[PDB]
A paper describes a structure:
We have investigated the function and structure of Trichodesmium Tery_3377, an iron stress-induced protein (iron deficiency-induced A, IdiA) commonly used as an in situ marker of iron stress. Using heterologous expression in the model cyanobacteria Synechocystis PCC6803, we provide evidence that Tery_3377, a commonly used iron-limitation biomarker, is localized to the periplasm with a suggested FutA2 function as an iron-binding protein of an ABC transporter. 27) and allows for structural classification within cluster D of the substrate-binding domains.
Amino acid additives in the crystallization buffers lead to the most ordered and best diffracting crystals. The best diffracting crystals were obtained with an additive mixture of amino acids. An amino acid ligand, alanine, is identified in the iron-binding cleft; the amino acid is ordered and coordinates the iron substrate. The geometry observed is trigonal bipyramidal, with the buffer molecule alanine carboxyl group, Tyr-174 and Tyr-231, forming the trigonal plane with angles of 108°, 108°, and 144°. The two coordinating amino-acids in FutA2 are contributed by a loop that is brought into the vicinity of the iron-binding site by domain closure around the hinge that brings the two lobes of the substrate-binding domain closer together. Interestingly, this motif is conserved in Tery_3377, and such a domain closure, although not observed under any of our crystallization conditions, can be proposed. The observed binding of organic ligands together with iron may just be a fortuitous observation, but it might also have biological significance.
Residue numbers in the entry: 4 to 321
Amino acid sequence: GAINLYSSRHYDTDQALYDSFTKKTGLKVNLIEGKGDKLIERIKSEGANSPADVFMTVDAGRLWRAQEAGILQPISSSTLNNKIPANLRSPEKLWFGFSKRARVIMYNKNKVQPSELSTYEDLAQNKWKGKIVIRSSSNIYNQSLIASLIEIHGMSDAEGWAKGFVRNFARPPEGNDTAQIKAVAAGIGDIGLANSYYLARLKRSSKPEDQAVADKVGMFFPNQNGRGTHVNISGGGVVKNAPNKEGAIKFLEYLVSPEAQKIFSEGNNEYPVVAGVPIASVLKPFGSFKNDSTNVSVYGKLNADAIKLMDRVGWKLE
Ligand SMILES: N[C@H](CCC(=O)O)C(=O)O
Ligand SMILES: [Fe+3]
């Protein structure tokens, strides 16, 4: 009568989702939390004795690592496949996206007009020297973005890009995504890269100071006239030895319902994955944007190459 959810992605507001699921299915949700890579290690080590039914985390790169650890089993569901865009789920049906984030250009509104922005590729141009802030190469979001660039350009051309990008750093990578947004607002950089939901989070904060930062920083969705913006996922899958496989599948299917999509996405100011679900009020002012159709599993497949490239060009680790 229960499922065991091992998640790094729980927010307090998600209790509404678990309670609705229980009303609809009869199944309790037992929550086990941890950091994503630690949960993968925990499930792998628990092995055939693991009680885990569902694993959830952020970033297709981490979901790929879970898949490679052998802790997931494939699921074939008409509901999951029809409702989740193909680009946002594993080609092998091992994991699935349930909310979406974009890795965007954050820009100082005083110093940068959006007409000056275009693509990720343009960020390697000399005009940005001394102007870019971004976090360390240890961060999965950055690894996944670089992986996408290696997929497009190949290692040689991507290395040339990365050499110019790193040359443009205003300071050594320092702090998290929110720290980059604050540095852009403060004039330490004119532009930075961060996930969309971090600006939204500031635009909603209980702290007035957070609203002041948010008002100074715009969000630009790159590559609109070409392949589209780099998107990534919060997602999950059914665990290999799930004691309640049937219940685990019911939970994933419930997550694509319109009501669950709203609660889950809005809990972290992310976009829904399901077509037709209304967008959070905080995200509407930024407008819709073209998403790249690349399958997000590529981000994991080329994660090791991204790490190698980052080291080669001297993009500092945390
Ligand atoms: N950075 C948070 C944490 C969740 C995670 O790191 O798994 C998020 O984007 O939801
Ligand atoms: Fe995050």
